[PDB]
Amino acid sequence: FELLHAPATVCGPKKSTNLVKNKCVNFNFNGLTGTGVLTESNKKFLPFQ
Amino acid sequence: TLVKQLSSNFGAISSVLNDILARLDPPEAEVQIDRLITGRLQSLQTYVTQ
Known part of the structure; x- marks a missing residue:
């Protein structure tokens, strides 16, 4: 298992x-x-984070 | 520097404790938790002395 915090799927x-x-x-x-x-916050993200 | 000291391994598998807890069985958790406990206790004693 490759354990991280990046977007997981499994x-x-x-x-x-x-x-x-x-x-x-x-x-x-x-x-x-x-x-x-x-x-609910107001911090405007970017399409990937 | 006190706050930044919390995000360090000190030798365990991971820094954040609440991720160690759900990731090791109780027979194995205490060793990692102990490494964190000793490290954080040392950091706190240093800050208090200064």
């Missing part, structure tokens, strides 16, 4: 949940084992 066989904003949750994105509050 993800495990577990179904997804929905999302709740403005409340402290322990999100699990494609990796990203953290905890915080999810607020």
